[PDB]
Amino acid sequence: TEEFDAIKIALASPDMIRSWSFGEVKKPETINYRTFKP
Amino acid sequence: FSDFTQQLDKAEKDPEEGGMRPNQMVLTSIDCPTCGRKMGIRTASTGVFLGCSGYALPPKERCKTTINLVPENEVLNVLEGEDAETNALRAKRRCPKCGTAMDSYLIDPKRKLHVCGNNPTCDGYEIEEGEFRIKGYDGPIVECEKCGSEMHLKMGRFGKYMACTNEECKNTRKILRNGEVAPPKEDPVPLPELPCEKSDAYFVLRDGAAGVFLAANTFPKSRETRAPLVEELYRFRDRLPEKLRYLADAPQQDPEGNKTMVRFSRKTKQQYVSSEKDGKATGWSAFYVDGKWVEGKK
Amino acid sequence: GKALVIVESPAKAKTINKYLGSDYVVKSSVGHIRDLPERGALVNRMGVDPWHNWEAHYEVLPGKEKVVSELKQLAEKADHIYLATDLDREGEAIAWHLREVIGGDDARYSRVVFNEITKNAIRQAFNKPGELNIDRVNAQQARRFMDRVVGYMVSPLLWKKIARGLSAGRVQSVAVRLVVEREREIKAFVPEEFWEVDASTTTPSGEALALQVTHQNDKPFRPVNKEQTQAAVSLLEKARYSVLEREDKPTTSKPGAPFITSTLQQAASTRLGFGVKKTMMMAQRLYEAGYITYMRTDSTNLSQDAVNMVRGYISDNFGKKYLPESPNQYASKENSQEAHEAIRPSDVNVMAESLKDMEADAQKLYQLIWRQFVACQMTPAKYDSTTLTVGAGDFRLKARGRILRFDGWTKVMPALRKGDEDRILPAVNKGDALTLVELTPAQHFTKPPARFSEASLVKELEKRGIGRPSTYASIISTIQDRGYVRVENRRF
Ligand SMILES: [Zn+2]
Ligand SMILES: [Zn+2]
Ligand SMILES: [Zn+2]
């Protein structure tokens, strides 16, 4: 697939992790039980 | 009492006979948003406010538009010490007609208003292209879902409503029996057969993000508070809108034979039923999960 | 049979029942128990008829039903009922109401007054008692009725002439007037510019000496503008400076009086940032836990026992130099009276740090009350004050210094910060020459009167005898809720 040659590891900069995320989660909610929807 | 009544009776008379002066309108150059007319500065038990002279005209030509006067709060600098009050006095404008200082108010995000200290004995007023922020009134701070601006709590002829401070948005929420605020407005059902207990009113059933609750028909005056019992819902099951019927299907009594009430599980956005003894929760609950009612310890 | 004793405060009851044990049944009314709820509607509302020889309609408070009830049955197993409320007219009236709510025959009732908790008091209480004073009771009814008429008859006039929801009252309306007058005072204030000139100099030795210009041509030096200030600096720059006089004198500092409700609120506000209501909440906790005396008092008096207790403590913990030959005296008002006592620790031996059952703020308040109480009975602080007079041409300059010699009471209540006179002055004798280093002119402006703070207004009210310890806080809130004044940055 990606044909990588090696693996690299380092600390996570906060801007980097925020760049990963597609959104913030702000409430402890999971899924509704009347209709099984998040 | 003789002295007091002598003063009271005299005060009751018309201003010309020595009676107490009734409040006095002092106009100013401002355009009423409903009719453009000059506007005057008025005091009520609620505070100090901007009014349009059409309030004194009979219904045909009556104007009930009013504006709230947000004052510019003096921010004394503790680091200035004894100077802090003196500089505050220096900060004030001075009235044209007299030496008395002037006190300052906001009318628009473009306009600012100065008023003399001896108002309404002194009629000096000034208007300035000064822009600051304005609050519709004050109370439980809320965020308007339609514009993100601050929302406050207001009172009027219809009791208590909640409105947004941005003059460009009239999105108004409302107060409800067992919650801080209610989204816009919702779908009510009245019951003449449930009497109130602290008041002579009757109970009505209401829905909102908070849940489903009972409320008294003279709501701003009665302000009486309770959740419905399952047996109550069962008794008025025919009146319940089609969705609400399931709550009437819910188990009416717990395994101990205590009585049950209807509650909102905010973490899962769904109604459930619970039982109480001596007004305390029994630690029992039943929920609706896919067309069935399931029950157990809380 | 068993004797029934009735007091106002529950905490005080529990304490009395102790220094008296069984055989007696102590309880408390916990307040008034009963109170008020031509035009008939107006009279029905007021509960008193000014047009019918003041006939009134008292009725148990909607929150004292239990108290009254539980007090009822207790009157059965009681031989002789002892009304032990405060000796003032309010207490006298509470006794009168109890007697008319419990019923029975006059002879079944007795009036006793408790001096202190000491057995040397709770004993003398039943020793030489008496009965309730009808005159005292009627005096309180007269006050209560006058306050009623004003509030229920003036407010309506306001509703008609001004706006609905408005109110007026003997205490309420003058509190607002005070704020209104200060407001107008501030808004009309016009700052006045004035200048000051200080001079840095060197003694014949080489030491630094700061001086302030006080006179020119024998008139107070006070230029109003920069121009005048310059004309003067020009002269001072070329003048010869010489010492005229050096007055060394011993001066003292004296501790203050123990707290009363008003001063406690002011001290808590200035040293702990506490608002009036909060201060009273903490004080209430402390009282109910037996650490201090009633939080509502207008007297700074101290019993002899209290005074021996504190001197005993000062003697063991600080030494002789801190203990005055005889008790420190204060307050000589010839019209003064005697009521409860001043706010102080119930036991001097109890430190704030040992009240682990109290909130941190309550410990801070206790510490404030404690230190004020112990400092009050210690010796004065002693300083050596020095005043230097200097001449320079037609000008007169001055320098003042002070060196602490003995802390006295400030040992327990330190000087938060050094004052302007808490400094030292170099050795110089009359006739000595001074060398000018630099002249610093400073522009200033007079400032407007300070705005009231909650405690500050309370202080003004008590000064004019307007309110009561138990009502000050309540007054400060009512005028706000009614919309007459507002608080911002802790100022009115
Ligand atoms: Zn208009
Ligand atoms: Zn003016
Ligand atoms: Zn909005």
Curated annotation (Swiss-Prot), chain A:
The gene is rpoC. It comes from Escherichia coli (strain K12). Belongs to the RNA polymerase beta' chain family. DNA-dependent RNA polymerase (RNAP) catalyzes the transcription of DNA into RNA using the four ribonucleoside triphosphates as substrates. Resistance to the antibiotics salinamide A, salinamide B, rifampicin, streptolydigin, CBR703, myxopyronin, and lipiarmycin can result from mutations in this protein. Co-administration of salinamide and rifampicin or salinamide and myxopyronin suppresses the emergence of resistance to both antibiotics. The RNAP catalytic core consists of 2 alpha, 1 beta, 1 beta' and 1 omega subunit. When a sigma factor is associated with the core the holoenzyme is formed, which can initiate transcription. The rRNA transcription and antitermination complex (rrnTAC) consists of RNAP, NusA, NusB, NusE (rpsJ), NusG, SubB, ribosomal protein S4, DNA and precursor rRNA; S4 is more flexible than other subunits. The chain holds residues 14 to 51 of 1407 of the full protein. Acetylated on several lysine residues in the presence of glucose. The lineage of its organism: Bacteria, Pseudomonadati, Pseudomonadota, Gammaproteobacteria, Enterobacterales. This is DNA-directed RNA polymerase subunit beta'. It comes from the Bacteria. Disulfide bonds: none annotated.
Swiss-Prot record, chain B:
GO terms for cellular component: chromosome; cytosol. One of its GO terms (biological process) is DNA topological change. GO terms for molecular function: DNA binding; DNA topoisomerase activity; DNA topoisomerase type I (single strand cut, ATP-independent) activity; RNA topoisomerase activity; zinc ion binding. Induction: Transcription is increased specifically in response to 2,4,6-trinitrotoluene (TNT) and its indicator compounds 1,3-DNB, 2,4-DNT, and 2,6-DNT. Keywords: DNA-binding, Isomerase, Magnesium, Metal-binding, Repeat, Topoisomerase, Zinc, Zinc-finger. The keyword Zinc-finger applies. Has been used to construct a 2,4,6-trinitrotoluene (TNT) biosensor strain. Belongs to the type IA topoisomerase family. Monomer. Releases the supercoiling and torsional tension of DNA, which is introduced during the DNA replication and transcription, by transiently cleaving and rejoining one strand of the DNA duplex. Introduces a single-strand break via transesterification at a target site in duplex DNA. The scissile phosphodiester is attacked by the catalytic tyrosine of the enzyme, resulting in the formation of a DNA-(5'-phosphotyrosyl)-enzyme intermediate and the expulsion of a 3'-OH DNA strand. The free DNA strand then undergoes passage around the unbroken strand, thus removing DNA supercoils. This is DNA topoisomerase 1. The lineage of its organism: Bacteria, Pseudomonadati, Pseudomonadota, Gammaproteobacteria, Enterobacterales. The gene is topA. The chain holds residues 568 to 865 of 865 of the full protein.
From Swiss-Prot, chain C:
The gene is topA. This is DNA topoisomerase 1. Mg(2+) binds at E8, D86. Its cofactor is Mn(2+); Ca(2+). Has been used to construct a 2,4,6-trinitrotoluene (TNT) biosensor strain. The lineage of its organism: Bacteria, Pseudomonadati, Pseudomonadota, Gammaproteobacteria, Enterobacterales. Monomer. One of its GO terms (biological process) is DNA topological change. Changing D147A: Abolishes enzyme activity. Releases the supercoiling and torsional tension of DNA, which is introduced during the DNA replication and transcription, by transiently cleaving and rejoining one strand of the DNA duplex. Introduces a single-strand break via transesterification at a target site in duplex DNA. The scissile phosphodiester is attacked by the catalytic tyrosine of the enzyme, resulting in the formation of a DNA-(5'-phosphotyrosyl)-enzyme intermediate and the expulsion of a 3'-OH DNA strand. The free DNA strand then undergoes passage around the unbroken strand, thus removing DNA supercoils. It is an enzyme of class 5 (isomerase). Keywords: DNA-binding, Isomerase, Magnesium, Metal-binding, Repeat, Topoisomerase, Zinc, Zinc-finger. Residues 133-492 form the Topo IA-type catalytic domain. The active site is at Y294. Its EC number is 5.6.2.1. Residues 167-172 are annotated as: Interaction with DNA. It comes from Escherichia coli (strain K12). The chain holds residues 2 to 517 of 865 of the full protein. It catalyses: ATP-independent breakage of single-stranded DNA, followed by passage and rejoining. Residues 2-117 form the Toprim domain. Changing E8Q: No effect on DNA cleavage activity.
